[PDB]
Design a protein around this ligand. Structure first.
Ligand SMILES: COc1ccc2c(c1CC(=O)O)Oc1c(ccc(OC)c1CC(=O)N1[C@H](c3cc([N+](=O)[O-])cc(OC)c3OCC(=O)O)N(C)C(=O)[C@@H]1C)C2(C)C
Ligand SMILES: [Ca+2]
Ligand SMILES: [Mg+2]
Length: 304
């Protein structure tokens, strides 16, 4: 990666501006709903400008431009922006078909940008690098990170996987790639300490984390990945005559937290945020109470 000096950061700004203009095409009919690329990219520009304002002399800019996380961040922001641009150039009119694979790929990129914004705000809070001081929520997960990586803010996927393998083995390439897509929110082949904190919060406890991840995010019909509150209500409408139908999902606005949606006996659709217990225990309890019976409306309800 190149040094993340001012010129390189400004080059990234110009690419992000082109993505914004591409996404303002009136034929796109883009809905103001998270992740909303037309808010995320300006917000990213604003936070990057804040960072530069905190590193406002030659020696400070030197430190910033050679910070390993920041160099990787800017390189990855530039690559995803070029990808977005290329998507429009190759998609042509297919970009305006709402359910085309091209538009689906735009939605994927909008999610990636949303995650990248959350990451940079977590690592440079108020524009100052704090990655070496980042506090991992789960103490046992924190001990793994510190043992193998110390105060590092970011690690290549290959290195991360090799260390994780020492604690939880992974033999399947399919499993490894699925795990990478869960952990590596920014899809840049690096695991940040922020991405590690989100993963270990969601799939706690740490001692069984691969089992928990498999049970919830791999082999569970109820798992819907990232959805908005409105999208949960809309998807569960078709199950409104099957009380006990339920799904669980992630919020791109509040990373690291699960939400559940279910159909009541009356046919109403309710949503709830489980607290102070791992999701799989909240599903166990909700099933034994008769609320969570049919994940995605299906008749097979996994048991843990
Ligand atoms: C993984 O997801 C999480 C995780 C944590 C939170 C979440 C969400 C929802 C999201 O991110 O999707 O959300 C908020 C939170 C803190 C503040 C906050 O905003 C200022 C919210 C947003 C909120 O409460 N919503 C309520 C809403 C949403 C849900 N539900 O998604 O499960 C349940 C609700 O109550 C049971 C609820 O409140 C409406 C009501 O009670 O009638 N309704 C309608 C809305 O339209 C929004 C979405 C916390 C608590 C930190
Ligand atoms: Ca990443
Ligand atoms: Mg803003």
């Amino acid at each position: 990666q190149a040094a993340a000096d001012r010129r390189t950061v400004e080059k990234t700004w110009k690419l992000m501006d082109k993505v914004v203009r591409l996404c303002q095409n009136p034929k796109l009919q883009l809905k103001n709903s998270p992740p909303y690329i037309l808010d995320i990219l300006p917000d990213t520009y604003q936070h990057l400008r804040l960072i530069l304002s905190r590193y406002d002399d030659n020696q400070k800019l030197a430190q910033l431009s050679e910070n390993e996380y920041f160099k990787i961040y800017i390189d990855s922001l530039m690559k995803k922006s070029k990808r977005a641009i290329r998507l429009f150039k190759e998609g042509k009119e297919r970009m305006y078909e709402e359910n085309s694979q091209d538009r689906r790929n735009l939605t994927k990129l909008s999610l990636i940008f949303s995650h990248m914004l959350a990451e940079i705000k977590a690592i440079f809070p108020n524009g100052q690098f704090q990655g070496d001081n980042f506090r991992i929520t789960k103490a046992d997960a924190a001990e793994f990170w510190r043992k193998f990586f110390g105060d590092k803010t970011i690690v290549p996927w290959k290195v991360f996987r090799q260390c994780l393998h020492e604690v939880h083995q992974i033999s399947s390439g399919l499993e490894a790639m699925a795990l990478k897509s869960t952990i590596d929110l920014t899809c840049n082949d690096y695991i940040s300490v922020f991405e590690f904190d989100i993963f270990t919060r969601l799939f706690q406890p740490w001692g069984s984390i691969l089992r928990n991840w498999n049970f919830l995010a791999v082999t569970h019909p109820g798992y819907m990945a990232f959805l908005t509150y409105d999208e949960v209500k809309a998807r569960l409408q078709k199950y409104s005559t099957k009380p006990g139908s339920y799904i669980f999902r992630l919020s791109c606005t509040r990373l690291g937290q699960w939400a559940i949606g279910y159909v009541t006996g009356d046919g109403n659709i309710l949503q709830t945020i489980p607290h102070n217990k791992p999701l799989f225990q909240a599903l166990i309890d909700g099933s034994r109470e008769g609320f969570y019976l049919y994940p995605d409306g299906r008749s097979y309800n996994p048991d843990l």
